[model samples]
Target chain A: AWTPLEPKLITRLADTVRTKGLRSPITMAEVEALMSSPLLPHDVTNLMRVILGPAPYALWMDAWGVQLQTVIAAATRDPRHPANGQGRGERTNLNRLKGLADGMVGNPQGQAALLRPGELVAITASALQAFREVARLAE
Target chain B: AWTPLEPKLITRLADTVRTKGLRSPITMAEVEALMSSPLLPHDVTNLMRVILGPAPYALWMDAWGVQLQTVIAAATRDPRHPANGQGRGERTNLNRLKGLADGMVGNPQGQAALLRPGELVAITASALQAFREVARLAEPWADIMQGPSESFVDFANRLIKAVEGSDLPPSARAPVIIDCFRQKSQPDIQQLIRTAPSTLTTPGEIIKYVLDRQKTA
Candidate 1:
């Protein structure tokens, strides 16, 4: 059930993927949402590789001591950081990655697993805590 | 249905609740599960006040405040002390209770509240266990593996969410869930269900899963 992103974004992303491969820049909101998801089992690497390929960013450290570069590179239409306007604590790296991923990753049927356990990606150890604080403040 | 607990432990819990007038040591699993529930009402006060009286601690606090408290309480059985090492899950009080009444409060909704608040609010054995652990861990031991407590709270949170979605509120969610499990009209199924061991790590999960599956079938 994904409405297509603007063709330009898709083409730019595709071109980025073709030349550099999938490391296109993604927004932070998508990254954090994926991380915060209790069920998704922590899938930042796959998400990053697919979205931010080609132009790699030093995303996260790997289990084997290697640093991973995202395949997806998302440049947002707006200047605000992903989820920047969110009424919570100051926008963070998790928010930036998660927001960007949300734009790119789509499993319409809830078909795919979202986050996993013990798989540390972009979101910090305290992202969930941050969200909880946000909830507290919102409440 | 009753699951087996060590008799000495049961007797100890019975002793603990003797003053509180709990019918039995009560369902530690049920009670613990309830405390850690995220869908717990924003308007209502501390869950234990409903069961044990005298409002109690917050689950979502910090490492000290989170579900580890329940683990220590359950592991040690002494919810109050540093190393009491296991007693009754309840039988003590906690700090930082919520917005509900301290004294006997009203359920003007009677059996008719929007959330059916009363029915779903019973403090089960699960909740009791959870409370005990919370106290023991938070106060006595701050640094410990948080596996068991996390599992219980996870279960509780799922159940709380199920009740919320029932939109029947706490009051209605219980009867609906209990009766569904009972099989009142369908004798054969009810009998089968009754005989079936209720192994749900969390009742809320069972409630939600059953309701969802039934909707389609």
Candidate 2:
């Protein structure tokens, strides 16, 4: 039986792809597994970060960890943090990115297209080249 | 005749060791290649990430990136931040860890030790593990915030108070608060953590230090 994905999970997945690019290898077995049960936010975050990169997980996380800190530093330097001083229900680029990091997930159409098995490796590899460049610039 | 390594190279190499575990298949050619010339920090960070990880550096970086964040987050929650409230020249575990991170570059003994191959991996790994523990412990509390609107200081104090009643050991708080500062995008404090000497171990010592820093700054 084909079960529907939780709305929250879909949103988180979308946001992850939007921000980090289709980093993880999208497999049929994994997708089906995700569909099987409700995932907590942290679990979703873990899943996204995994899909965001490759195996053993630590190096990718460490690399992204530095980038996140670099970007966060850039955003905070503008004197517009704590949600960019937005009065209420307002958001900042930093918040958007933070949500991206936290699995707030966006860009579903892009995410779905990218999540296909054969489609992902080429795109992610391309994205990784860009990622390496951005990381260099951050340093 | 062999040339001495650029003064800053050891620091960069040490940084690399901290981020990427020593990738095996070490060649004299590779180490010799680096020794013959200078290394910028970025070059070192990038090259090491590529060399140390399994093929495709990005995967490794991303994997380690999440763990690094985890550890950093944990350290930030603890009060043992190396320079949290110290005016100048104050020593703390964070600084000690940071100093160790920097390969003790300023010290001749450290430099000599670093110059010898194979010595840094174990030391840096130890520092990395210290951070990992802090981050691991703080996972449950990472999202339990007082509120988004609360000033960070107030929230931080509230967290300190809250932890007082929890089962976490007194020694653990320093790393957690230090991690918190790092996550806040406070590089100066992170730098302190990256470079200072650490001696104190208890959460109270860190809390007092941070409170004093808050009062003074």
Candidate 3:
């Protein structure tokens, strides 16, 4: 059986889809996963490691370490960060066009289909490109 | 025709090769790549970003983007950072690992290698594994980035305390709080770590450490 999802989050997203005509490639399972977005945290963690280039952080994330919904909430709410008061949350928000994109987990198209009309596209890509570029050097 | 290498450096390696007699399993290309270490300035800047992890510093690196040599130099000359504390220069050390693993070009292996020691070893089973796993999160602590406000500030501040200065009384002492963000070019994470953070505490000592560590032991 699927684990139960949080009531508050479900209600909130549902209201969004219904109130505003939305579209999303993401399903409930996908949305649930996105709600607790997993890989993003790790990616973000590593991304920060690369971007910050060795500044230290008390890393609490283990593989599959963080709860998905919790990550979503933190990312959404504290979009600004302690990152030198840069006010840029690594600009993680975006559309995943290829094999693995951070924003793809949510299915904005699905969300657009689900509720609320708006454009979701990425302009200045940083970590994603950085992650891709870094992989080239791997042994 | 090749760029002149430090002669003493070759002598030290010759001894290691002769004494240990353990040739690297990889090709000379590996050694050449290793020896031809990319010491880019931007890479050092990014390396600074990784190790420093979002803290404002008190000193200036010889250059923003640096190589293993320069970063080591910076690490040594840096004042005793009370916040981060100098014991083994823990934060700086970890930052070095992260930067190395990420690589000058930001490769997966670069970041992976820094996590451990051997080339392909990965983060676990290495020095980095020990520290990243140091703390576990409960509910509230688990989701630090979302909201709650001051917590991020507190965490960033703690990083400062760990590496440079702590929010302590002036009568006590101060740690080196240097500028970490000036280098905005390449962000060479790997070059920063491959072997920089191991030695040097204050600023000037780094030069001695690099000369000592390079092929000497």
Candidate 4:
């Protein structure tokens, strides 16, 4: 259960990242662990506002919400009832991304205000770096 | 040449050891390095008085000065003097120990007041422990409130420095420091801790938590 104290902690962590940048002692992994947990919508929204600033956050969420809705529609659509066809593999990939997105911010537009853009970008960078490092192993 | 700020820094470091004891992040090696450098006698004396209580320090010095004088006579005496016979090796050993003691307190009597007992003992424990970890590795609180005009962060740093400079062992630092906060910090900070209650067990964690709370406010 998320308590009232969590938003304060999140804001502090965001401030630390903003002030220290790469020098921050907090790891991207820690941020990922926090994001993976269920958080209150307002807590997510507050985190986004601090990291991205209110103006940029407002713009980013509108664009992000649209993208998330499109992905959700494609991922959850009934294949037999759908106008456009999607393969089982494509649906599975979409479903995985949707799960990731849901864990971060539920219902896109409904919880768009709660999204943490700074933390999201950090996690994204970390994931991308990890993927690159592991890609060599796959080859 | 010592800078005008050096004394303040030394005092701050001394204050840290006096409060934290063995829990201080400052290593005995760092203290030793500072002491080994040429410093004003008063600076050395201030460090000592802070580390050892004034009365015990006075007694310790009276005895130490006599011992140093005796060793200095023996180490500097002529081998050809008719009074006593001593080997070159004995003189060499005395010279080495004298250097060690001198590096710590300078002239035993002249700088006795400046001797940092807590820091000296800590460095002694560190050097000796390194020589015999199996044998010596097992070796070895004050209320200071926040000032009215002091910021919470400044008070926290001051409190932490005092705790670090203390004679208390590492294990006792956090609890003692927390207790000090309960008793001595500003009413608002005290109330915050009382209302929320800290789960933090380490000095650094509790301090950081307080800082975070202040920032939030």
TM-scores vs. true structure, each candidate: 0.19, 0.18, 0.16, 0.28
Error of 3 at B128 (Å): 14
Best by TM-score: 4
* Docking class for candidate 4: incorrect
Candidate order, TM-score descending: 4, 1, 2, 3
Rank candidates, lDDT, best first: 4, 2, 1, 3
Q: Give lDDT tens digits, candidate 3, residues B6-120.
A: 4454444344333332221111111222222232222323332332222221122321223324434544566453212356634344344335423524554344333322211
Off by over 4 Å in 3: A1-22, A25-31, A37-139, B1-66, B79-217
Error (Å) of candidate 4 at residue B35 is: 9.5
Local distance difference test values of all predictions, in order: 0.31, 0.38, 0.29, 0.44
Better by lDDT, candidate 4 or 1:
4
lDDT of 1 by residue, A28-136 (tens): 3333444444322123333333333211211122211111112112212332433233444432333233433352233211212232222223233333333333222
* Candidate 3 residue lDDT tens string, A39-60: 2222243323322211222221
DockQ values per model: 0.01, 0.01, 0.01, 0.02
lDDT of 2 at A2: 15
lDDT of 2 by residue, A1-139 (tens): 1122333354345455546543334432334446344322223333434343221122333434455455456545654443244353332343343234332343222233223232222223323433343333221
lDDT tens per residue, model 1, B83-187: 221456433222211113233134323212222222123212224335554444432111122243233223333433344333364556544444443532244
